[PDB]
Amino acid sequence: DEETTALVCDNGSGLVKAGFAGDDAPRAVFPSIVGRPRHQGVMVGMGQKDSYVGDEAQSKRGILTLKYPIEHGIITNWDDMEKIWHHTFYNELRVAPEEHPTLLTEAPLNPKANREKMTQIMFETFNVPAMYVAIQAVLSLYASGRTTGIVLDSGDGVTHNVPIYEGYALPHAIMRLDLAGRDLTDYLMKILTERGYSFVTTAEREIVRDIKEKLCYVALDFENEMATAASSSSLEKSYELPDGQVITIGNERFRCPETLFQPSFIGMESAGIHETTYNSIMKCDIDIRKDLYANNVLSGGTTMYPGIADRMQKEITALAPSTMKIKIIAPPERKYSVWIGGSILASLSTFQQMWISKQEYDEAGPSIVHRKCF
Amino acid sequence: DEETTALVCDNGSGLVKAGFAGDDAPRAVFPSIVGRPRHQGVMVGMGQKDSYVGDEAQSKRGILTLKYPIEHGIITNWDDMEKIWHHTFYNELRVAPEEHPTLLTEAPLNPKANREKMTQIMFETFNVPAMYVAIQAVLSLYASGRTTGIVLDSGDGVTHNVPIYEGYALPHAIMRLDLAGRDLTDYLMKILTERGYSFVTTAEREIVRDIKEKLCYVALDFENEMATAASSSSLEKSYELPDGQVITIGNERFRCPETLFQPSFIGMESAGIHETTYNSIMKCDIDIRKDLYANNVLSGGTTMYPGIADRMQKEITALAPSTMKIKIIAPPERKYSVWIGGSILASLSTFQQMWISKQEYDEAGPSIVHRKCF
Amino acid sequence: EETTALVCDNGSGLVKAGFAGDDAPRAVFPSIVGRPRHQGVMVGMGQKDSYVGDEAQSKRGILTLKYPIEHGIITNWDDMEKIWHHTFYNELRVAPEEHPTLLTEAPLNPKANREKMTQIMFETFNVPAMYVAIQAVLSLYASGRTTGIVLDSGDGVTHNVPIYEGYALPHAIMRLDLAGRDLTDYLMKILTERGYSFVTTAEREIVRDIKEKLCYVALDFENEMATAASSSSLEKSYELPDGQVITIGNERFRCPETLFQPSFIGMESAGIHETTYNSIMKCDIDIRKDLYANNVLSGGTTMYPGIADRMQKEITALAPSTMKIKIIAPPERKYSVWIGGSILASLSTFQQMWISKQEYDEAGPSIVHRKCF
Amino acid sequence: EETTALVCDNGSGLVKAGFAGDDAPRAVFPSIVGRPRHQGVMVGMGQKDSYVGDEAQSKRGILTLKYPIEHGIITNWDDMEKIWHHTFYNELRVAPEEHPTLLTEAPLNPKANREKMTQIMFETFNVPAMYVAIQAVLSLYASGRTTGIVLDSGDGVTHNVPIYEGYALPHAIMRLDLAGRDLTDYLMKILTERGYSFVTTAEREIVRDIKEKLCYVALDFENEMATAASSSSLEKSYELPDGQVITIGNERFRCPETLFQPSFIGMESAGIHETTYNSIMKCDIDIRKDLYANNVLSGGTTMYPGIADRMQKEITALAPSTMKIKIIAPPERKYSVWIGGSILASLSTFQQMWISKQEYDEAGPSIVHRKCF
Ligand SMILES: Nc1ncnc2c1ncn2[C@@H]1O[C@H](COP(=O)(O)OP(=O)(O)O)[C@@H](O)[C@H]1O
Ligand SMILES: Nc1ncnc2c1ncn2[C@@H]1O[C@H](COP(=O)(O)OP(=O)(O)O)[C@@H](O)[C@H]1O
Ligand SMILES: Nc1ncnc2c1ncn2[C@@H]1O[C@H](COP(=O)(O)OP(=O)(O)O)[C@@H](O)[C@H]1O
Ligand SMILES: Nc1ncnc2c1ncn2[C@@H]1O[C@H](COP(=O)(O)OP(=O)(O)O)[C@@H](O)[C@H]1O
Ligand SMILES: [Mg+2]
Ligand SMILES: [Mg+2]
Ligand SMILES: [Mg+2]
Ligand SMILES: [Mg+2]
């Protein structure tokens, strides 16, 4: 109880996590997808809706078109986002937002107008008493109970990096890279055509994504793994499509995740995630690098490939001096790391003074977000 | 016990020595540095201070800025000095100064206002029952148990000279030189850039200082030492930085301490320390010079370079007549020579009458320091 | 050099063959294999059991037409060996033992398609050398250009690929299923609303010939349907082989419109005007200017009247108004791929990239995917 | 005169070359070496494997730009020999066998940087003589002065050095890391807050051109941000090569401000107005009066509008109010170093300090650090 009962929402990109503050796990998880009917629509007395949002669209995806409003972190369809927020407040959580402060998350290095429009909708359409916006990668350090370390948060829209030393951030050592899990699915679709399988419908992008989540893995070494797959056939697995017609996957199993370390497979000029996180460490001060090397933290859904922790260690020690020690912390839960940190933050007694009240918004306007109250 | 238990404090410049009177060694040694946070400061519930003073600033020097209150000996930041004195009385010594007379040190040829402000702070903010101020180089003769001799006290702020003959000082033969250990570190930073190493951050000045304290040494002869280093590579040592990336030092090893004997490397017009101490001897009376030549005393931290005692002897006998004998006394301990003399002085039964009492300060004011009670 | 290299363009539904260094292909004939359907009374006739090529078109009234290539990928390997034998001994009248050959292949195809083609040529026909090239790359050789974006639409598949100063961008290549074969099927379906039925596979040729002579692309679709709804000045007559002339109304300009609106059949992909715009925006920022002014058209299905003006109108509606957009349409389009192949197989610098018999024996059929494509 | 000495200014990001005794450099081109990135289809093109100079700028859409020099020090010695070959045979069209050359070097640089430059010129190119001079010393020759303090800020490093009546003070020389290259990177970061992304190394040239045309220095920073917050009269438009014009607001005057407030990136050093004040106070007491009234500006990165008035305002806030302070800004600033080099290499008294081939053979590469600098 306590009559405060703050709310936590993690918009993300492609997955929505919602729940109450002070719990252990989110109470509602569902994709952020809005669908529209495509075909003629014969017969009568059915009483069927004109748009489906959430898990309902996944069930009926065979006749309707999937569309994603949020992309690369920035929201592009504001009319669709108000539909998703209405679904996770009245239909799933079954709560009235009039007496419930909410907490939201935002990726680093985003357009300023993205934050301002979110504040207008919550404070006017939903009439929340208070609200807040926090960086996703900062909350990931609250979950682990740490104060020092470098966090690599890779999700579906964008992966970013930020170092923190004893509760102080370094804004000039923050790196952002577009490569994410959405671009990995598209690459898998392209290289699957070389075996004879065609997946072009937007409703068939979910079929390819499910294959990636179950079969793909990261190889420790790329040159000699392609040699073993070229001769023997012990690296093949079978997948059953919904209508049947089972398929076989060969060396494409470990080729799609490799794009993270070699982003030249799509055509980008940036370096891999192992070199991006090394440049951030070398951008900080000299005497704080030692504690940053031994406190590498992994978070995000796209980081749960098997063998990704061992591959990252091998590449990092090849660049760093051989004297020091390097370790990577990978908690058993990674997808909900951001939400857990948000629940912890919204329960401290010292945090109850940094809420953005309704009175402040009326006097100052939507520009109050960029002030000392972030 | 004895319920008197006088206190001894040596402010210095860059190092603070504190302890009780009648002991063998100081009980508290820590740098005189005050630091301020530099970066944004994300996170909550940390409860972190706004300023760190002493050994705490050295540990966290990677995010904060180091600042020194005393320069060339005189105090420039009076607000910061009250912070250091509070740290060495309640936090480190763990004592109440209300029932503890204190003894302080001061360099020769200093502004008059420097002494007056020190008396005001101790007698009003801390409410000491008594206090005293003594010259640093006079106390260095108490430690050695001598009465005659010339003392060259070189520290971090300023080096000075003063001759004493059988308990009588000669104020007109006192020489003060600007060069000290702080200017030696800056010269090492400049000549290190010719090999490819850059050290510009104020927190990186501690890295360069530690190299000087471990590798540098004084060469007996400068012309032929540069010839051996030019051909062979047997004069090089390696240093490991905190993050790794070991470095190599060549002929810069013996070039930085040479500035003491040749102050033209920075641009000063004054003579070296070997000629400054010779002019002081020739400024005294004719028949007392014989005892001054054979009683040369070395004190201070910056005088603990290897080979500095033999180099000083070689240059001095080149100027003095060849008939007489010249020797230099270098005790195994040199950094604590001033503190040891202060402890001895504050324990004699005949010294208990020259304390500056609270009653005298109230009646006369801060100008009582310049009277017969120094 | 006395090489006299050979050039062959398999395509899908039309075969172009000839010698290297000439101006036009020497043999053009459909790729169709037919089988008798009826009883077969009478004696002393001495009639064959299968007809391939132009022979099947003449006798299509008693036999069934079958296509071995669908959307580009070969599905009947036994029938393809029959077609290749026809274009080497019966039409070209040549012995392939002393004649290097050049073949074409569409982008984004199964890997096994290339490997099986190499096995047949190097073993059944015993060619001394062979090569495989992309169809849309050869279309730029014919025009004598080095920069530009090529939209090659044929009978099986239309594809797009940008090239800038002799460098390709493999990540900006788009492939679309829609082609000329799906346009004929749509015409058959909408012809039933007037009373005409065309269901036999030998009657698909009747509908195709109507499309090649009457259909055209309209500049605007909304107001063209208004003029056809009121007046009857947009109707033409076609005479069937046995007579019974027919009339075509607004179906004349409705079948080609499927290219710009692929929702008429049920596909979710965008039209050819939006597919080629996405490819341009997928490249680098400073090379887009030269790509806008060097749009090249090739392929048989691109020879609809008014298709060049319609493409220009839609493209400038999306691109910024500052720059200029033009489309290059050579007077010959069906033979653009073959002409580029003849030019490539004659340069002195190309004589080193042939896949020799010695290399195939040592390495095997996997040599195609190596540096020698 | 058969001597015809050569002058070369390597710099960092721009190369100035020409003959001695002229008015302006004859060849100016960026110091960039590019490598192809993509597949490279097509044949008969005959295209090179690396482009250096202005050629790489034209074709930057398919290749990667790389800079050999960084912060004054040369990091890629294999690439530098390619640039020097380009400015001697391809652009200047001269044979260096009978042409003494003059080179420039920044203060407080690694000793090995000077030695390697002497080896390449005296062995690979076989010059009869050569010399190396400090960049900021040559800037005083152009103005025809003898006393003054020179602040030379370029693309790699800004440095300061006071000179009084032909005598230098080596102990009052300050070197700062901040330069024009770090200003471009800051502009890229703060441009993302409006929605524009510039991440490709070929897109760093787009951002640099915006800085050279729109950015300016504001006299006061606190009240300028107030006017830009309310009105929209401080916005200008820029047209990208493909179109899609953009708008710049208060970022117009925020990027150059980093010079006076280097805490925007994270550096702890003071601004250029306080660095030049500390150098003056490091000299002797009676020579400061002539140094205050002879402040000289040189370098490309000093040609921001309003930079001369802003520097004056901050300097007089620290110096005593009795004396007068002025800043000399010649109409030409980018070529100030080259002009001084041409003047020096023409005096009759300078013809004795050349480093001859005979001296190098007898002494070796260490002759550079001797009395003949
Ligand atoms: N077990 C797994 N293996 C590989 N990838 C996964 C796995 N589980 C999820 N993913 C990928 O992670 C993405 C989800 O990331 P998520 O944590 O939801 O980020 P966000 O909250 O920003 O959407 C999906 O696109 C999916 O492709
Ligand atoms: N072993 C050593 N060799 C050379 N220099 C030293 C050594 N130890 C200390 N120093 C120098 O001496 C200085 C400390 O002098 P110190 O005795 O503390 O004088 P003060 O008490 O006036 O600060 C330091 O700056 C350091 O550079
Ligand atoms: N004049 C024309 N107008 C419209 N369509 C045509 C015309 N001529 C040919 N076509 C179409 O083009 C197709 C032939 O394309 P073609 O160039 O042979 O491609 P491929 O070589 O891949 O078979 C035929 O199916 C036909 O429908
Ligand atoms: N008009 C201008 N306004 C602002 N900056 C400029 C202008 N012209 C040139 N610059 C900057 O000056 C730099 C060139 O400096 P330059 O004189 O070439 O030094 P160097 O010779 O050491 O390369 C470029 O990086 C550019 O950003
Ligand atoms: Mg996330
Ligand atoms: Mg001392
Ligand atoms: Mg074709
Ligand atoms: Mg320059």
Author numbering:
A (entry chain A), B (entry chain B): 2 to 375
C (entry chain D), D (entry chain C): 3 to 375
What does the literature reporting this entry say, word for word?
Skeletal muscle α-actin and cardiac muscle α-actin were purified from rabbit skeletal muscle and the left ventricle of a bovine heart, respectively. For skeletal muscle α-actin and cardiac muscle α-actin, we could resolve the N-terminus starting from amino acids E4 and D2, respectively. The lack of resolvable density for the very first amino acid of cardiac muscle α-actin and the first three amino acids of skeletal muscle α-actin may be attributed to a nonuniform PTM pattern of native actin isoforms prepared from muscle compared to our recombinant nonmuscle actin isoforms with uniform PTM pattern in that the entire N-terminus region could be resolved. In addition to Nt-acetylation in β- and γ-actin, we could resolve the methylated H72/H73 (H72Me/H73Me) in all cryo-EM reconstructions of actin isoforms. The inward movement of the D-loop (RMSD ~0.91 Å) is also observed in the recent structure of cardiac myosin bound to the thin filament compared to our structure of bare cardiac muscle α-actin, suggesting that myosin and not the regulatory proteins tropomyosin and troponin drive this structural change. Near the nucleotide-binding cleft active site, amino acids C10 and V17 in muscle actins are substituted with V9/I9 and C16 in β/γ-actin.
Actin isoforms are among the most ubiquitous and abundant structural proteins that facilitate the functional organization of the cytoplasm of eukaryotic cells. Actin isoforms share high sequence identity at the protein level (~93–99%) and the propensity to self-assemble into helical, polarized filaments (F-actin) from monomers. To determine the structural characteristics and differences between actin isoforms, we solved the high-resolution structures of single-isotype skeletal muscle α-actin (3.37 Å), cardiac muscle α-actin (3.07 Å), ß-actin (2.99 Å), and γ-actin (3.38 Å) in the filamentous state using cryo-EM. Our 2.99–3.38 Å resolution structures of filamentous actin isoforms show that the N-termini of bare muscle and nonmuscle actins have different orientations that contribute to distinct binding interfaces for myosin motors and likely other ABPs.
